[PDB]
């Protein structure tokens, strides 16, 4: 707080102004760091209050995108209730929890002018999971097409007039937010904010909406930051995983025969500015996988409505008025092969990228990188067993071929002895969906993917005991997250530390089966050829969920 | 028009040179001679782009502008050219019938300057577009003659579409002709370097969807040119196109595709292609133990593979034999064991044995005249490695006799120039195959600097050592900064270490009469630098037993003095 | 610089070098260029051949990359720096620098001296060589000029009309037209090709319906009416398709911006005025399609059930093809800008009206963009801006309730042109906007006649003007004092009444921190801010005895050889 303090103020601001908002002694500790942080370097403190204050103020988004993300939250949770485990679905209707939630949600919108038009479409009780769902698809389509015809480049001088006049408020050389995260020991070569560019862009996400402000630094480098006004409060866990897989990267970079192919995790930065607003550099023009699916399906005559519509009415067609049920599973193989056969065919993403790059050279050196870091992605999923990977939760870079994810969330209770997190992933071990297998190789899938996924494990188990000394605290905070999520959490007792150690040995043991060639002549990576032998099989992809989207 | 009493030499000899003319009316008169005397059916002109033009047009200029003349001169007189992939801007008509509600309904008040105005558009824009195909073509041709990047972007878009009318019963003839155009038109095309050369006619084949099924060696011989990354299109496409039928096409595509990967010498797209191509498991075990860096167990598993070979099992695909013995030689050369394969280099492998010239020796004066009876008989088709050896023999001959020949500093520089020829053969992206060449440059500026070091001590027989010759401390201190990096490859590390030890032994046995006069203290003993350092980097890859056995040339002249015992016992203990 | 080397006097050539290495490097990325002999090569050749150096690596790439002439000079200044801390200095640009060194080394009738220099650089370091480059970042994404547009064709040997791409040569042709040292047959025959795609993209927007010549007045009187809904419809709709829309739009933008360039070439100017003027009076009647079509943000709250026609190219790119496209550098084309904007002013103020045309037609829609270029970078853009609004203020001089509605945008833009434009930019920009600010300020103040009219735009304009009498760069401060003098004569009230609203929003940042902090630009800004206060009859006469002791102490402090600073030492900056 006395020497460095710009490496403190971003996080001290939001944890002080969250613990001192929703709530004793800790926020009186957090006032001291801000006060002694205020005495030394005062103009740094006030000059950061300008950025935090104005970025909080002027980027309160609009009165149509709250309705957009409101609709789309209602749809992604609506089909989650429609297929979660409600019934065997014999002509369903809405349960009372839904009507209590969205009658309650009328005050969540703006006050004046939605309310006759949206309240005129569910209070009539004609919602029966056929009017409700298809109605929300109509509202999402009209609202999305409303957000086409808005402006793509809002001028900064009329949007937030202070941040254009910022660089002639010219003193003390504010360093760029988001560079004290990775280490780079010398601390004397950071880029400072020279000026904020005009023409703030405007990105219509598939499930949300955000703008990005792009900064010119004094070296002459232009690089952006996606600003997003609602960030859900499990962002912090996504940040702390972003503190973990960058933390391995030094001793993983120092190792030979990792560095020969330079796997280098390449997981993004994320800094806070608020208890609700974080900015992080979703830079120019790199997409998800789900946006490729929308571009293909609407490039075809269909839309992603017709897939879940297709398996929904085929699935319940095999139950209502005729109930054979040979099982769910052998039926799910049949509808899955119907989806691959008649919709969404093979090598759709390969047909995307080989038609997106001119000069095929530029494509080839694409996937030789794309097969590498996806490997360093899949390990990052297999270690510290996270979640399913919905294909709007992973982000491919379109320049080099990098891969990262939002939603780094580590979550069970089927064993109430050994209660906490880091139990199993359901039916497939990770994501190796066939429409990224047809792009990934079958030659790079073994010569690049497998040997990476072995090389990381033996590169991490034997520097010396690093996984223990990191994962002690970095699993411990997930334990405190597991107690503090429920209203249980009062059992901080010396079972805590061995309760950490059993999951520590579960993970360090878990990264060992793919990690050592033991005694005999194996091929090598036989735990990897085994587990990708399971992760690609259609019997195993048929039983998993439908938002996971095993067809693409 | 038909008088064949003149010989037709000059409709071939300057006539096809008549578009090199760099004069407008000249060139247009020659091409209007050609295009007003030939046929019109575009298939029977696409023959006479490939069947005719027997002029080689040796190595000068992209001759496909004239090809695009012989097919662009057969389009039609269409006056619409309806563009159909862009969803054009907001309409004049249909956008102005989107208000039925409030009947404003102006009723013919066209008495203003608008009466002068609006009709003036309709007379204009009906005649302002009027776009015909031929006028659109004839202003694109002069884009070609200024710049050769539009002929490519027009040929790639054209050629797989005129080919869409090449029906069967004329298919194998066009394939059989285009084979004779890509590789052997009795002509070697050294047409340019790094620019547009054959890629126009080599990218577009990949956009065909399968005319290219026979040749596969034509598709490989075009690698002395450009088009590295442009033929991997043609070879990787069959794996997503072939069937079970005619597997010899398939494994032919995989094996010469593999040695395209050998020329590019990336290995991660090589082992996967073997282990999804191979038959025996022991290739998968062996190659999978190579790519981690564990060459000793891959050596052992190949030794298991030969005794399982030549039996009643699968025929080992008649190339895994060479894979086992060539990787046997490689896995030998990585660790140590320079002494073992010397007599195997004698019974076969003439070009091998000059790589086996580090037989724990550092003098070569026992066979100083017995090597260039092989070096001068290997410098047919030279490489910068073999040229580096032929530079090294005179580099040591100048060290043996005082004042020598000084032939090296006009013998080395073609050593650089051949490596730059190989640099230009490789493509423009940083391939790892460039990697060796960088180390190659790092040795050449160590050869010429070699001709500065001991030649400044052959000349310095002045007997003023340890007070004048501080150039040893300066430039030998400069030998400890081109270290190279701790992850490159083991072969080039042992190369740099042993050959720098040849230089050290020149500056030991070239000091052999200078010894008894004093033994301030001069004695070098800094071969322990590359031995303790190479022991550390020979630990950091793999193989602790090697850096144990590479602390074996340390028991010469004492090697104890400043820090050599420190990291000697540090690395030998901590190993 | 090309006439002394080995001269000893250049230890007096040390007081001036960063003040020129800034003032060469803050323009050399941005001058673009002239008719291409020796234009950015001049500034590169200055920054190389001069005598702490993070500066010099930025032009050093430009020598090796584009230029076949500065090669040996950049190599000879690349060798001589080769200790330990050099690797963070070249660090941002290595993937450029070490790319350029791969371009040179090549066997040809190409030189046998500079390539061996490259080999000597790449061999004198061997471990500083390849540990800086990683698998490659910058790839090519079938960008701006790279997309195809597969128009129909007909080839005489085939039955069916084969579709093939209409635009192979739209990179090369547009590279020919800009290129100066070229024969006129290929450049003229590049203009004959390149605009033909521009004519293809408007071809299915050139047909006009049967009863149309009167229907524009039906569109114009539709603006003056309330409650325009539409039929309640429940139909699905195609969607955006973003990065094909952006490629086709920016493509079309490059075509007609290439028309605007193609005006300033002889034996092409008359023809480019024919096609250019015919496009500009074509692209004003589509603007009323943009008016009543995007009148659907009003006339009721939602009526979500709409028609919303099919997501076509809006023809609001003329908004980004006058201002952005004619901030150019040759500036004979800037005549085509003022001619252009006058022509759309007469047609927009012709078919639509003359008092309502400044309410909904094209003139505010592009005057917003002329506001926007005043906040831009790159002084060429500002020179497009102030010229664009001076063609605004001399045609909306008399017929204007407009300019009093959009005043506070215009004074902010014309004060931001002054407020930050670099010193090495030509000073015909910051003295042709102050005068223009006084032209507008004289126009929009000609009817306030008492000391009471300070309602809204008067209040924000005076608060904006007088509350910025500090910052720095005293073209702006003396521009402000000259503005307050020149609007205190048109119904001249005292300056104090032109300040009494904002006399308290000007002194609290002055008296708030005492002084001896917040470096020199705003310090001289506060003191020369209180030039202008005490030079008037009756204001500001108390409580500043601390200010006088701190400025007076800020000169009795003999600034040589003591603490005349806060953080940066006299030995560092000079």
From Swiss-Prot, chain C:
User: What is the name of the protein in this document?
Assistant: SAGA complex/NuA4 acetyltransferase complex subunit TRA1
In terms of the parent sequence, the fragment covers 816 to 1401 of 3744
Q: What else is known?
A: Although strongly related to the PI3/PI4-kinase family, it lacks the typical motifs that constitute the catalytic site of PI3/PI4-kinase proteins, suggesting that it may lack such activity.
Question: Looking at the record's lineage, which domain of life comes first?
Answer: Eukaryota
Domain characteristics, as noted in the entry? The C-terminal domain (2233-2836) is essential for its ability to interact with activators. The FATC domain and precise positioning of the C-terminal carboxyl group are required for stability and function of the protein.
Q: How does it assemble?
A: Component of the 1.8 MDa SAGA (Spt-Ada-Gcn5 acetyltransferase) complex, which is composed of 19 subunits TRA1, SPT7, TAF5, NGG1/ADA3, SGF73, SPT20/ADA5, SPT8, TAF12, TAF6, HFI1/ADA1, UBP8, GCN5, ADA2, SPT3, SGF29, TAF10, TAF9, SGF11 and SUS1.
What family does the entry list? Belongs to the PI3/PI4-kinase family. TRA1 subfamily.
Q: Where in the cell is it found?
A: Nucleus
The record's HEAT repeats, renumbered to this chain, cover: 14-51, 52-83, 92-131, 247-285, 361-398, 456-493, 542-574
Query: What job does the chain carry out?
Result: Essential scaffold subunit of the transcription coactivator SAGA complex. SAGA acts as a general cofactor required for essentially all RNA polymerase II transcription. At the promoters, SAGA is required for transcription pre-initiation complex (PIC) recruitment. It influences RNA polymerase II transcriptional activity through different activities such as TBP interaction (via core/TAF module) and promoter selectivity, interaction with transcription activators (via Tra1/SPT module), and chromatin modification through histone acetylation (via HAT module) and deubiquitination (via DUB module).
């Amino acid at each position: 707080a006395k020497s460095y303090p710009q490496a403190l103020h971003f996080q001290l601001r939001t944890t002080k102004e969250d613990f001192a908002v929703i709530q004793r002694q800790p926020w009186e500790y957090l006032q001291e760091l801000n006060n002694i942080l205020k005495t030394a370097y005062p103009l740094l403190a006030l000059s950061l209050e300008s950025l935090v204050a104005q970025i909080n103020d002027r980027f309160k988004s609009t009165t149509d995108e709250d309705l957009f993300r409101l609709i789309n939250v209602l749809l992604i949770d609506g089909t989650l209730n429609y297929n979660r485990l409600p019934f065997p679905r014999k002509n369903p209707k809405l349960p009372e929890n839904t009507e209590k939630n969205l009658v309650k949600f009328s005050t969540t919108l703006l006050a004046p002018y939605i309310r006759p038009k949206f309240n005129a479409d569910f209070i009539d009780n004609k919602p029966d999971y056929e009017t409700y769902i298809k109605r929300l698809r109509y509202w999402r389509r009209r609202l999305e097409n409303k957000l086409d015809r808005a402006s793509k480049k809002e001028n900064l001088e009329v949007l937030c007039p202070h941040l254009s006049n910022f660089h002639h408020q010219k003193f003390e050389d504010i360093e760029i937010p988001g560079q004290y995260l990775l280490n780079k020991d010398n601390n004397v070569h950071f880029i400072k904010i020279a000026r904020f560019l005009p023409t703030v862009d405007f990105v219509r996400g598939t499930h949300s909406s955000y703008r990005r402000l792009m900064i010119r630094g004094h070296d002459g480098s232009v690089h952006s930051f996606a600003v997003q006004y609602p960030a859900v409060r499990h962002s912090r866990r996504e940040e702390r995983m972003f503190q973990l897989y960058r933390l391995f990267n030094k001793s993983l970079s120092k190792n030979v025969e990792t560095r020969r192919r330079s796997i280098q995790f390449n997981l993004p930065i994320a800094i806070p500015l608020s208890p609700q607003v974080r900015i992080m550099n979703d830079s120019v023009s790199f997409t998800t996988l789900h946006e490729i699916h929308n571009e293909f399906c609407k490039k075809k005559g269909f839309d992603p409505d017709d897939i879940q519509d297709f398996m929904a009415d085929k699935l319940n067609a095999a139950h209502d008025d005729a109930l054979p049920a040979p099982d769910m599973t052998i039926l799910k193989v049949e509808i899955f092969n119907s989806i691959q056969t008649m919709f969404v065919p093979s090598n759709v993403l390969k047909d995307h990228f080989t038609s997106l790059f001119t000069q095929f050279e530029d494509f080839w050196l694409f996937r030789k990188q794309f097969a590498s870091q996806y490997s360093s992605f899949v390990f990052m999923s297999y270690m510290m067993m996270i979640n399913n990977r919905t294909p709007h939760k992973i982000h491919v870079d379109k320049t080099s071929g990098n891969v990262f994810t939002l939603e780094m969330l580590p979550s069970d209770l089927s064993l109430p002895p050994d209660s906490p997190i880091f139990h199993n992933n359901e039916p497939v071990p990770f994501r190796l969906t066939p429409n990224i297998q047809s792009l990934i190789g079958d030659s790079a899938l073994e010569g690049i993917f497998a040997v990476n996924l072995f090389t990381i494990s033996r590169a991490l188990i034997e520097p010396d005991n690093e996984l223990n000394t990191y994962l002690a605290l970095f699993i411990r905070d997930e334990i405190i997250s597991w107690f503090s999520n429920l209203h249980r959490p009062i059992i901080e007792n010396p079972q805590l530390r061995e309760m950490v150690q059993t999951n520590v040995d579960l993970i360090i043991r878990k990264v060992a089966q793919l990690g050592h060639l033991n005694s005999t002549p194996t091929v090598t990576t036989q735990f990897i050829l085994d587990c990708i032998g399971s992760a690609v099989s259609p019997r195993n992809l048929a039983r998993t969920d439908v938002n996971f989207m095993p067809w693409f | 028009h038909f008088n064949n009493t003149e010989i037709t030499v000059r409709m071939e000899q300057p006539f096809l040179v008549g578009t090199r003319v760099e004069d407008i009316g000249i060139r247009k008169r020659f091409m209007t001679i050609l295009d007003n005397s030939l046929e019109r059916d575009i298939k029977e002109r696409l023959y006479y782009v490939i069947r005719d033009q027997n002029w080689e047009f040796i190595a000068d200029y992209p001759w496909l502008n004239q090809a695009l003349q012989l097919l662009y001169g057969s389009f039609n007189r269409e006056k619409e050219l309806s563009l159909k992939n862009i969803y054009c801007l907001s309409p004049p008509s249909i956008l102005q019938e989107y208000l039925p509600e409030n009947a404003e309904m102006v009723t013919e008040v066209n008495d203003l300057e608008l009466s002068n105005f609006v009709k003036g558009h309709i007379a204009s824009m009906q005649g302002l577009c009027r776009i015909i195909s031929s006028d659109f073509i004839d202003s694109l041709i002069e884009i070609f003659y200024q710049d050769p990047k539009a002929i490519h972007r027009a040929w790639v878009t054209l050629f797989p579409q005129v080919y869409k009318s090449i029906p069967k019963n004329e298919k194998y003839g066009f394939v059989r002709s285009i084979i004779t155009l890509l590789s052997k038109p009795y002509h070697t095309r050294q047409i340019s370097s790094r620019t547009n050369v054959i890629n126009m006619l080599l990218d577009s084949i990949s956009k065909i969807e399968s005319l290219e099924l026979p040749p596969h060696l034509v598709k490989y011989l075009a690698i002395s040119y450009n088009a590295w990354y442009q033929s991997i299109n043609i070879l990787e496409s069959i794996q997503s196109n072939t069937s079970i039928d005619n597997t010899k096409i398939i494994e032919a595509n995989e094996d010469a595709l593999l040695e395209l990967y050998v020329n590019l010498q990336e290995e991660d797209m090589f082992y996967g292609l073997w282990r999804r191509r191979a038959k025996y498991t022991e290739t998968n075990i062996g190659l999978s133990y190579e790519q981690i860096g564990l060459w000793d167990k891959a050596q052992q598993l190949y030794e298991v593979a030969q005794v399982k070979a030549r039996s009643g099992a699968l025929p080992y695909s008649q190339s895994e034999y060479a894979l086992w013995e060539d990787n046997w030689i490689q896995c030998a050369e990585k660790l140590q064991h320079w002494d073992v394969l010397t007599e195997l280099a004698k019974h076969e492998g003439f070009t091998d044995l000059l790589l086996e010239c580090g037989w724990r020796v550092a003098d070569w004066n026992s066979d100083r005249d017995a090597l260039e009876q092989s070096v001068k008989s290997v410098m047919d088709v030279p490489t910068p490695r073999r040229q580096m050896f032929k530079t090294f023999l005179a580099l040591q001959n100048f060290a043996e006799s005082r004042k020598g020949d000084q032939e090296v500093r006009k013998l080395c520089d073609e050593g650089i120039q051949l490596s730059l020829i190989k640099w230009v053969s490789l493509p423009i992206r940083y391939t790892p195959a460039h990697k060796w060449l960088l180390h190659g440059f790092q040795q050449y500026m160590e050869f010429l600097e070699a001709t500065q070091i001991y030649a400044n001590l052959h000349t310095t027989t002045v007997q003023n050592l340890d007070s004048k010759a501080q150039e040893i401390k300066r430039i030998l201190q400069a030998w400890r900064d081109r270290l190279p990096n701790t992850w490159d490859d083991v072969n080039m590390w042992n190369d740099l270490v042993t050959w720098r030890q040849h230089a050290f032994q020149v500056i030991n046995n070239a000091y052999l009469p200078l010894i008894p006069a004093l033994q301030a203290y001069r004695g070098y003993h800094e071969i322990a630098w590359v031995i303790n350092r190479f022991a550390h980097v020979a630990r950091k890859h793999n193989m602790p037993d090697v850096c144990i056995s590479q602390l074996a040339r340390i028991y010469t002249l004492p090697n104890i003095e400043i820090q050599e015992a420190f990291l000697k016992l540090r690395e030998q203990a901590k190993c | 610089f090309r006439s002394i080397g080995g001269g000893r006097f250049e230890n007096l050539y040390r007081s001036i070098k960063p003040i020129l290495q800034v003032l060469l490097q803050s323009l050399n990325q941005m001058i673009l260029t002239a008719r291409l002999p020796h234009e950015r090569e001049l500034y590169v050749e200055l920054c190389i051949t001069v005598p702490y150096l993070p500066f010099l690596m930025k032009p050093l790439v430009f020598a090796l990359q584009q230029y076949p002439d500065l090669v040996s000079q950049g190599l000879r200044t690349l060798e001589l720096c080769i200790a330990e801390y050099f690797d963070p200095i070249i660090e941002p640009v290595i993937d450029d620098v070490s790319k350029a060194l791969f371009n040179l080394l090549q066997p040809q009738p190409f030189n046998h001296a500079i390539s061996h220099n490259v080999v000597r650089i790449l061999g004198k370091l061997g471990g500083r060589n390849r540990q800086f480059l990683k698998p490659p970042t910058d790839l090519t994404e079938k960008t701006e000029l790279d997309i195809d547009a597969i128009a129909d064709f007909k080839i005489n040997g085939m039955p069916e009309d084969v579709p093939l791409s209409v635009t192979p040569g739209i990179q090369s042709a547009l590279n020919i037209l800009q290129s100066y040292k070229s024969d006129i047959h290929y450049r003229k025959s590049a203009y004959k090709y390149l605009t033909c795609v521009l004519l293809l993209m408007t071809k299915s927007s050139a047909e006009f319906p049967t009863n149309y010549t009167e229907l524009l007045k039906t569109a114009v009187n539709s603006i003056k009416l309330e409650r325009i809904g539409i039929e309640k419809n429940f139909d699905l709709e195609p969607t955006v398709n973003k990065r094909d829309y952006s490629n086709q739009e920016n493509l079309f933008l490059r075509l007609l911006e290439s028309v605007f360039y193609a005006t300033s070439i002889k034996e092409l100017k008359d023809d480019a005025m024919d096609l250019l003027n015919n496009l500009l009076d074509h692209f004003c009647l589509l603007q009323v399609n943009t008016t009543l079509l995007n009148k659907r943000n009003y006339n009721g709250t939602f009526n979500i059930d709409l028609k919303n026609p099919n997501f076509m190219l809006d023809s609001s790119l003329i908004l980004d093809a006058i201002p952005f496209a004619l901030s150019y550098y040759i500036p004979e084309v800037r005549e085509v800008g003022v001619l252009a904007y006058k022509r759309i002013y007469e047609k927009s103020c012709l078919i639509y009206g003359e008092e309502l045309a400044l309410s909904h037609s094209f003139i505010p829609e592009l005057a917003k963009q002329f506001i926007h270029l005043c906040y831009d970078e790159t002084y060429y853009n500002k020179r497009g801006g102030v010229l664009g609004i001076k063609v605004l203020i001399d045609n909306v001089k008399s017929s204007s309730v407009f300019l009093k509605k959009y005043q506070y945008n215009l004074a902010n833009g014309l004060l931001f042109v002054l407020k930050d434009t670099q010193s090495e930019a030509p000073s015909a920009i910051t003295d042709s906007a102050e005068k223009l600010l006084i032209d507008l300020l004289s126009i929009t103040f000609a009817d306030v006649k008492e000391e009471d009219l300070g309602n809204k735009v008067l209040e924000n304009t005076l608060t904006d003007i007088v509350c910025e009498l500090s910052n720095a760069n005293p073209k702006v401060r003396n521009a402000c004092q000259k503005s307050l003098h020149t609007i205190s004569n048109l119904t001249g009230i005292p300056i104090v009444k032109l300040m009494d609203h904002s006399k308290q929003f000007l002194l609290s940042p002055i008296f708030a921190k005492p002084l001896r902090a917040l470096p020199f630009t705003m310090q001289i800004g506060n003191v020369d801010a209180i030039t202008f206060c005490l030079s008037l009859p009756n204001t500001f006469l108390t409580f500043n005895e601390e200010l006088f002791r701190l400025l007076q102490e800020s000169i009795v402090l003999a600034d040589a050889e003591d603490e005349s600073l806060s953080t940066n030492i006299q030995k560092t900056t000079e």
